[PDB]
Write an enzyme that holds these catalytic residues in place. Structure first.
Site, PDB file in Angstrom:
ATOM      1  N   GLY A 103       1.614  22.589   8.388  1.00 16.14           N
ATOM      2  CA  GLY A 103       1.208  22.120   7.070  1.00 16.14           C
ATOM      3  C   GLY A 103       1.045  20.618   6.990  1.00 16.14           C
ATOM      4  O   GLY A 103       1.504  19.993   6.024  1.00 16.14           O
ATOM      5  N   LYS A 139      -4.038  14.959  10.824  1.00 10.47           N
ATOM      6  CA  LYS A 139      -4.333  15.677  12.062  1.00 10.47           C
ATOM      7  C   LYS A 139      -5.044  14.731  13.018  1.00 10.47           C
ATOM      8  O   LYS A 139      -6.277  14.615  12.994  1.00 10.47           O
ATOM      9  CB  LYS A 139      -5.174  16.924  11.795  1.00 10.47           C
ATOM     10  CG  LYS A 139      -4.866  17.620  10.477  1.00 10.47           C
ATOM     11  CD  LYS A 139      -5.392  19.047  10.470  1.00 10.47           C
ATOM     12  CE  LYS A 139      -4.868  19.825   9.276  1.00 10.47           C
ATOM     13  NZ  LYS A 139      -5.273  19.202   7.987  1.00 10.47           N
ATOM     14  N   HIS A 148       0.007   1.475   5.857  1.00  7.05           N
ATOM     15  CA  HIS A 148       1.111   1.625   4.921  1.00  7.05           C
ATOM     16  C   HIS A 148       2.464   1.283   5.528  1.00  7.05           C
ATOM     17  O   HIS A 148       3.428   1.112   4.777  1.00  7.05           O
ATOM     18  CB  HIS A 148       1.145   3.055   4.385  1.00  7.05           C
ATOM     19  CG  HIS A 148       0.071   3.351   3.388  1.00  7.05           C
ATOM     20  ND1 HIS A 148      -0.650   4.527   3.398  1.00  7.05           N
ATOM     21  CD2 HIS A 148      -0.405   2.628   2.349  1.00  7.05           C
ATOM     22  CE1 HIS A 148      -1.524   4.513   2.408  1.00  7.05           C
ATOM     23  NE2 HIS A 148      -1.396   3.372   1.755  1.00  7.05           N
ATOM     24  N   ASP A 174     -10.993   1.975   1.578  1.00  7.82           N
ATOM     25  CA  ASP A 174     -10.077   3.108   1.610  1.00  7.82           C
ATOM     26  C   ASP A 174      -9.862   3.557   0.176  1.00  7.82           C
ATOM     27  O   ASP A 174     -10.397   2.968  -0.769  1.00  7.82           O
ATOM     28  CB  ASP A 174      -8.754   2.737   2.285  1.00  7.82           C
ATOM     29  CG  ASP A 174      -8.089   3.919   2.958  1.00  7.82           C
ATOM     30  OD1 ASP A 174      -8.219   5.047   2.442  1.00  7.82           O
ATOM     31  OD2 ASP A 174      -7.432   3.718   4.003  1.00  7.82           O
ATOM     32  N   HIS A 232      -6.462   4.322  -0.576  1.00  5.24           N
ATOM     33  CA  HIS A 232      -5.093   3.864  -0.746  1.00  5.24           C
ATOM     34  C   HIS A 232      -5.032   2.353  -0.574  1.00  5.24           C
ATOM     35  O   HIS A 232      -5.663   1.797   0.329  1.00  5.24           O
ATOM     36  CB  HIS A 232      -4.162   4.520   0.273  1.00  5.24           C
ATOM     37  CG  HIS A 232      -4.373   5.994   0.427  1.00  5.24           C
ATOM     38  ND1 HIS A 232      -5.115   6.532   1.456  1.00  5.24           N
ATOM     39  CD2 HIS A 232      -3.943   7.040  -0.317  1.00  5.24           C
ATOM     40  CE1 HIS A 232      -5.131   7.847   1.342  1.00  5.24           C
ATOM     41  NE2 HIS A 232      -4.429   8.181   0.275  1.00  5.24           N
ATOM     42  N   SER A 240      -8.991  -5.643  -0.970  1.00  2.12           N
ATOM     43  CA  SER A 240      -8.665  -4.230  -0.838  1.00  2.12           C
ATOM     44  C   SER A 240      -9.361  -3.463  -1.948  1.00  2.12           C
ATOM     45  O   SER A 240      -9.087  -3.697  -3.133  1.00  2.12           O
ATOM     46  CB  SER A 240      -7.152  -4.005  -0.882  1.00  2.12           C
ATOM     47  OG  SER A 240      -6.745  -3.578  -2.166  1.00  2.12           O
ATOM     48  N   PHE A 241     -10.263  -2.556  -1.568  1.00  2.06           N
ATOM     49  CA  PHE A 241     -10.946  -1.676  -2.506  1.00  2.06           C
ATOM     50  C   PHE A 241     -10.226  -0.334  -2.454  1.00  2.06           C
ATOM     51  O   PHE A 241     -10.249   0.344  -1.423  1.00  2.06           O
ATOM     52  CB  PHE A 241     -12.415  -1.528  -2.123  1.00  2.06           C
ATOM     53  CG  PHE A 241     -13.196  -2.805  -2.208  1.00  2.06           C
ATOM     54  CD1 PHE A 241     -13.776  -3.208  -3.396  1.00  2.06           C
ATOM     55  CD2 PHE A 241     -13.350  -3.605  -1.089  1.00  2.06           C
ATOM     56  CE1 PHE A 241     -14.494  -4.386  -3.467  1.00  2.06           C
ATOM     57  CE2 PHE A 241     -14.066  -4.783  -1.153  1.00  2.06           C
ATOM     58  CZ  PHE A 241     -14.638  -5.175  -2.342  1.00  2.06           C
ATOM     59  N   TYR A 265      -5.084 -15.964  -2.626  1.00  2.00           N
ATOM     60  CA  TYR A 265      -5.560 -15.381  -1.379  1.00  2.00           C
ATOM     61  C   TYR A 265      -5.161 -13.915  -1.278  1.00  2.00           C
ATOM     62  O   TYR A 265      -4.778 -13.427  -0.212  1.00  2.00           O
ATOM     63  CB  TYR A 265      -5.039 -16.170  -0.181  1.00  2.00           C
ATOM     64  CG  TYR A 265      -5.565 -17.587  -0.108  1.00  2.00           C
ATOM     65  CD1 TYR A 265      -4.982 -18.607  -0.848  1.00  2.00           C
ATOM     66  CD2 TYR A 265      -6.641 -17.906   0.710  1.00  2.00           C
ATOM     67  CE1 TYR A 265      -5.461 -19.902  -0.783  1.00  2.00           C
ATOM     68  CE2 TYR A 265      -7.124 -19.197   0.785  1.00  2.00           C
ATOM     69  CZ  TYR A 265      -6.532 -20.190   0.036  1.00  2.00           C
ATOM     70  OH  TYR A 265      -7.012 -21.479   0.108  1.00  2.00           O
ATOM     71  N   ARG A 323      -9.404  16.311   1.986  1.00  2.00           N
ATOM     72  CA  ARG A 323      -8.300  17.191   1.638  1.00  2.00           C
ATOM     73  C   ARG A 323      -7.139  16.461   0.977  1.00  2.00           C
ATOM     74  O   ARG A 323      -6.188  17.118   0.540  1.00  2.00           O
ATOM     75  CB  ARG A 323      -7.814  17.918   2.891  1.00  2.00           C
ATOM     76  CG  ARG A 323      -7.220  19.285   2.628  1.00  2.00           C
ATOM     77  CD  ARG A 323      -7.089  20.068   3.922  1.00  2.00           C
ATOM     78  NE  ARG A 323      -8.384  20.430   4.485  1.00  2.00           N
ATOM     79  CZ  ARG A 323      -8.578  20.763   5.754  1.00  2.00           C
ATOM     80  NH1 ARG A 323      -7.586  20.759   6.628  1.00  2.00           N
ATOM     81  NH2 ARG A 323      -9.801  21.094   6.158  1.00  2.00           N
TER      82      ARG A 323
HETATM   83 ZN    ZN Z   1      -6.345   5.853   3.276  1.00  2.00          ZN
END
Ligand code: ZN
Ligand code: ZN
Lengths: 367, 417, 417, 367
Positions: free
Chosen positions: D20, D24, D134, D169, D171, D190-191, D215, D263
């Site tokens: 689960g 992957k 992250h 991204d 996130h 960061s978008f 910055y 997903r």
């Molecule tokens: Zn991501």
């Protein structure tokens, strides 16, 4: 007994902040006389904070920021008008005459007091001219330019492994917390009013990050905490923190702006209640640095700081104030103590108890 | 499945609509609103009785200025309905007659408003009512009395209206025209100001700590700071509870606030109270009968910014409860308000002015002389001031005629009541 | 000062209270509620007519189970009031008779509920109504028909109730007793589940990213993730709009949320919608006629923590608008709900159960067998389950008698409809 | 033309995350074949990321954290059960077989690709196995353990003064931003989707602090941004940022979880739209590091990354997919492109325009 060190220079009283200034440094001199008039001066050791070198300030601050502060005089504000926005100097904390000379002495007592405190010279160092905590690494915040607390803590870490910083005040100490937010060498317990207050930081969830993940304790409070509630929350929290942390040298920042009737603050502490906290920290018998911050209502602040000095000396001082140099300010009461105001305490016991349980829970993760 | 109580919240609406329809299209209706009709089931005119029955059955009441008299008398004789309260509040040169009307009809609300007007204009109009005027206060009391002695009082010359300009604040004085008697400079920036009982309160200082409060009237008397740091927070005065309220505001983190605090002149303390339903900033405050109305301002939008708000919030001070009105303001944005009788004369944008009566749901509009106005109410007069230096105008509510009435300030930051 | 419209919001209340008082203590009242009385101004009994007049004048209606019949008939013949709607919703063994009643009185809401009950229990009860049952679906359709051919349908054996225990989810099957036909394990933690139209939807995964959604019925069919990360968010199914809603929730920042999102089975998309008035976490959801009711949970307290909430929030899906009820729940804390007919059987704490009808304002209580229950409604039956393994009980709404009715799970995390 | 570098090792496909598992890694191999089958392999230079030494990881990470990650095998979870809570490893990002070997290769492509990129060897380096952002200094967050992006940026700063990091991204990239939040050497645009999303950080007001006060650029977005809106917000913002900042070497983290139908994600970008951003950044003709993060819906991710490789090669690839090793997954469509879903775009032009104006205003304070 308990050796105590005092730091004071007279000229600090001539640094006029400006017309309509909440911050009046000369208040400390109206305090110094209460030490002499009561006679606490003889039993004590009295010194003056010597000049803090520009290099010394370049231990936590940036070189550019200290250079900017040193090179700005009141006549030449025009040349640096552009840099007054990058460093937040000129409006909220306006520039005045001898600003750098003022920080030569407000900071000169913390580093030079921690020098004696870390060494085997004293159990309690006193500096009522310090207590500046809102200053940032490369910015002036609040009414502070050079963070004497952070410099003193760094100077203390050389001789001690773990350092507890207690912030008895009504404002959250931003500079100290962010300076040690991501390190486990210094835990910063800060008792402060939280909400839509000046600093904007100090959330109950701001418990730390990185290696110092569980080394940032904050106790948010509302307006008007009484003496009893403050003491009953202060003694157990501090005892538990020390038991779980084993501090080597504690830095107490006492802010007389926590007293009832201050011209900026909104706490309801009395002189007795404010000295209850220092005596509580004395019970543990660890090195105690004493930084005097805030101090806006000059009468209550003067009385509180003189009483705190008396507590540090473990002496007795009568309530009836002897005719002093500034007795006219003290008014008809003539009393050394101030009666608490009739404001409501918004900190209910359930709220206080819940926050105390959260803090205990966070302390249980201490390695 | 066996037992439950069924309460139909729409029963009253259905029955009212049906009675309206059947009665209009074809004793209970009147008796359900008026005790005197119930008791019985000349004084009033047919035209006035038409509006009376329209209020009995339909509740639709509009007035023209010339009928208030009857709309008072009948509404105090035929019934004790909310019609009487509204007409008497609306009635609240003509002071000497309204005094007698209130005395004869036992109205403890119109009487005080009329006594205020009569006392303020005693010089311009020079038995028991005279004693009440004298006891209330006053500017020639002794001369008017000559035209007993212990039944007299004096308050010197209270400032009618204040105004902060550019940094010194001028204590404008109204004489029955305008006068400039009084002047005092400030070294501080003023975030908000309020006039309590003939005294000036100013809150401000540095923008990160805008809590310093002063009572400058020897000026610079320091007062208790507020426990919050907010900009453009609405400051209101309530002498009824002797409390100065600070509602709404924008935090230094660019976030709107819904906190409410109140001061006490007698105790010199600030106390927090119930929060606002919707956070707003820069809204105009109006204290009506102790209830605070927060009008306009800015409201959250796009999760990061603010848009011109057009909401009306109501803070009940007696119950300390906040609620948002179900209707909307005519316009939105920077706004100024001034309480007059039971109305709020709200001014915003340009050539826009609305007379709003918050107990009800309706906004009227009056034409301006078609030039950022700031309005200020006096004992019986409305003064409109231009943001930049004619510099002052007098608004006649009845005729909507702007009549030009001494100004030494280039700018006009605040115009207090 | 010259023109304004006066609308008295209390006119209807005053007139209704006065008519009630004068009429009770001594044609318009009835004609204002019922069109047929208006037209005219035996079938009903004196006892029933007493409640009828009580509804006409006072609107106070309580029922005992034995009068619904008349409370239906009269309320459909004398008037088209909300009384008829309430009685029919309440009416929504006896299926064969309620079918005829709904058909004869042209109720398109009672008819479908009755057809559902008749079709579900066709085996246990083995002209045009029969064709409607057959067309709706069904488990011996051909046998019942023998006891035309193209007017028949089959759905195999849809799972009546699902339940997640301890991690595998058991597809419990109700046969007219309980049966266990179906079983499937999951490798994921389940934050929420919503058996939709005979299919199981489960949302969860890791706690910092609890968005993964699965349709396990070959199981593990992946579905569109939600754009929010919330724990204990209320998941509700609305086949009326073919949409699965996710209301409320608690963020990973220990902060309550008031966001609402909805899924579409046909389009396989998630869309944000209007926010909740008050942020809650762990509240029980109940979809009644498309309106979502969020009950209990946790609400903000002390500026940093949460307290057991006792609020009722209402999300109107047709208008997509949220509002909080003006009254309060009997209790507060962790809660479970299950929709039955037009009621919500809410269970919380211990030996506590309330039948709450959200269209109105009243909560009833039924005695439990005095043992953390979890309730689940079936086609016509109520099943109560113990959190820890008798493991199951059947609740008779009329008699409140808990009757013991196969369980292989030590724990009981979720009990879906 | 434009020299391009590829980094890939086959064994990376055998790191089964667990039952689960949204993540992957083997998806990258289902991508590699699309490079070979389309023939892009010949025109390109292909390498494999070599093992990243423990010392190399101890450049931004702590020694204790990397030691913990290296010393935890699936059989011995019992011994380190206590430390699995201090480092956030075991539940949200569970431990599996060869975890350290997995990070030997996920990170091995970023540092070793930036080695060629900073030197005069390539204008575009590619690493689809990286893109892990992250991870924290001493904690595993999300699905990341060693922050390959931060290591690559640090390795880049040696050869370049100013480094722009673009995070394409859904996130917010927490590790990179906090790693460079208080420095002016690296600006991190960061978008990302903002709200009650996983990272919890990336507020419009999180514009920076300290010397790197201005910055830190973040562009919050809602769910379901279309291709046109994303491109029209991406080109001008990036152009303005570069004009005001003069970057020397840009690090683009492309996350295929931004594609429609992923997903886990909820964006509506297509393959064409996702390649529009990389081509836009190519127009400026600066060194471009390419880290492939996210990648959860393995079909859309495989197609997107192969197309991005084609764009990097400035070649043409037919829409009709040739029968591949995993064609059964690609299904009946056989198309290399994916039709966008029918989800609503919550980013109205007024919202987008206002945020763009705020970002321009914040960029105007750039020294
Ligand atoms: Zn991501
Ligand atoms: Zn302070």
């Amino acid at each position: 007994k308990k050796k105590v060190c005092y730091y004071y220079d007279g000229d600090i009283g001539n640094y006029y902040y400006g017309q309509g200034h909440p911050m009046k440094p000369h208040r400390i001199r109206m305090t110094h006389n209460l030490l002499l008039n009561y006679g606490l001066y003889r039993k004590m050791e009295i010194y003056r904070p010597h000049k803090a070198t520009a290099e010394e300030m370049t231990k936590y601050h940036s070189d550019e920021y200290i250079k900017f502060l040193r090179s700005i005089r009141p006549d030449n504000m025009s040349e640096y008008s552009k840099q007054m926005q990058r460093f937040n100097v000129g409006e909220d904390c306006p520039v005045f005459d001898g600003l750098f000379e003022f920080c030569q002495l407000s900071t000169g007592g913390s580093v030079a007091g921690a020098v004696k405190l870390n060494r085997q010279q004293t159990d309690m160092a006193v500096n009522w001219a310090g207590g500046l905590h809102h200053a940032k690494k490369s910015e002036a915040s609040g009414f502070c330019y050079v963070n004497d607390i952070v410099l003193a803590i760094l100077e203390l870490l050389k001789y001690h492994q773990r350092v507890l910083y207690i912030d008895i005040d009504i404002h959250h100490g931003d500079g100290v917390e962010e300076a040690f937010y991501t390190t486990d060498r210094v835990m910063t317990v800060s008792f402060h009013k939280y909400g839509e207050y000046f600093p904007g930081t100090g959330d109950l969830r701001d418990i730390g990050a990185g290696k110092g993940k569980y080394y940032a304790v904050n106790f948010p409070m509302r307006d008007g905490i009484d003496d009893e509630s403050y003491g009953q929350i202060f003694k157990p929290i501090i005892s538990k923190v020390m038991e779980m942390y084993q501090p080597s040298a504690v830095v107490l920042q006492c802010g007389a702006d926590s007293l009832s009737g201050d011209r900026l603050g909104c706490f309801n502490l009395t002189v007795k209640g404010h000295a209850k906290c220092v005596e509580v920290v004395k019970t543990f018998n660890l090195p105690l640095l004493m930084l005097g911050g805030g101090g806006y209502t000059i009468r209550n602040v003067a009385r509180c700081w003189t009483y705190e000095t008396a507590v540090a000396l473990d002496c007795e001082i009568p309530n009836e104030l002897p005719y002093n140099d500034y007795f006219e300010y003290f008014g008809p009461d003539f009393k050394l103590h101030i009666s608490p105001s009739n404001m409501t305490n918004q900190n209910t016991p359930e709220y206080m108890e819940k926050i105390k349980q959260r803090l205990f829970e966070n302390l249980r993760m201490l390695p | 499945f066996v037992n439950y109580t069924f309460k139909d919240r729409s029963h009253s609406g259905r029955v009212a609509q049906g009675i309206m329809k059947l009665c209009l299209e074809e004793r209970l209706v009147l008796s359900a609103q008026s005790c005197f009709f119930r008791s019985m089931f000349q004084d009033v005119s047919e035209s006035v009785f038409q509006l009376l029955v329209d209020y009995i059955y339909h509740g639709t009441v509009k007035l023209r200025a010339e009928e208030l008299q009857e709309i008072y008398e009948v509404s105090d004789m035929y019934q004790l309905t909310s019609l009487f309260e509204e007409c008497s509040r609306f009635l609240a040169g003509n002071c000497l007659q309204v005094m007698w009307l209130a005395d004869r009809h036992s109205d403890p609300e119109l009487y005080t408003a009329a006594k205020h007007c009569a006392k303020t204009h005693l010089a311009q109009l020079q038995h028991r009512l005279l004693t009440d005027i004298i006891s209330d206060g006053v500017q020639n009391p002794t001369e008017a009395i000559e035209a007993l002695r212990t039944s007299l009082k004096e308050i010197g010359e209270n400032v009618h209206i204040y105004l902060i300009g550019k940094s010194l604040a001028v204590s404008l004085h109204c004489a029955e025209s305008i006068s400039v008697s009084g002047q005092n400079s400030l070294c501080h920036q003023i975030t908000a100001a309020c006039k309590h009982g003939g005294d000036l309160y100013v809150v401000g200082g540095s923008i990160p700590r805008p809590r310093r409060m002063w009572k400058c009237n020897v000026d610079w008397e320091w007062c208790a700071p507020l426990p919050r740091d907010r900009l453009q927070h609405t400051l209101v005065s309530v002498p009824g509870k002797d409390a100065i309220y600070s509602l709404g505001g924008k935090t230094l983190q660019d976030t709107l606030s819904n906190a409410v605090i109140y001061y006490r002149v007698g105790d010199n303390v600030w106390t927090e109270t119930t929060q606002l339903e919707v956070a707003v900033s820069g809204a105009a405050g109006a204290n009506l009968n102790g209830i605070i109305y927060l009008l306009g301002g800015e409201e959250n939008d796009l999760d990061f910014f603010t848009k011109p708000s057009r909401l009306i919030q109501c803070f009940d001070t007696e119950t300390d409860k906040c609620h948002v009105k179900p209707y909307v303001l005519p316009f939105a944005g920077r706004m100024h308000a001034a309480v007059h009788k039971d109305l709020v004369f709200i001014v915003a944008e340009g050539d826009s002015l609305v007379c709003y009566n918050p107990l009800l749901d309706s906004f009227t509009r009056l034409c301006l002389p078609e030039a950022l106005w700031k309005i200020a109410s006096c004992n019986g007069s409305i003064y409109v001031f231009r943001d930049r230096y004619a510099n002052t105008y007098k608004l006649d509510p009845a005729t909507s005629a702007v009549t030009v009435t001494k100004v030494l300030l280039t700018n006009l930051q605040f115009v207090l009541a």
